[PDB]
Amino acid sequence: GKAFDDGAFTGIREINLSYNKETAIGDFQVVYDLNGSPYVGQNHSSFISGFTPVKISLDFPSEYITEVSGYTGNVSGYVVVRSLTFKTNKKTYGPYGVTSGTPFNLPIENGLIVGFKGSIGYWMDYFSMYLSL
């Protein structure tokens, strides 16, 4: 898949992703906060189509992610991220995609997600998060 790396910013304002209830997560794009103004991250699109778009609009900076969780699993021979859930201090968004495979979860007691990197081919292959205080 094509690797991407957004880098670290001052917070997150909005997450736009797309999924398919049979396969996995497809498109991924973030609107970050950069010192009080939105910074539109580059769109990281799947190599194919047919996904259902989702827009996760956060009331920044009062609302911020306190936990990211999801499932990784095999899709057509590839281990990919089949599902993602974003929990804030205000609400829970997801799960999006298929909740089967091996679960993972990152509850944050102190700190903030300020950035994402990973890889998307047909589906999201993997992904990492930047953390800071």
Partner: peptide, 15 residues
């Protein structure tokens, strides 16, 4: 180096 760094956790997914 002249680039700041941050904690990074992951990746989850393909190896």
């Amino acid at each position: 180096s002249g680039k700041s760094q941050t904690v990074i956790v992951g990746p989850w997914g393909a190896k």
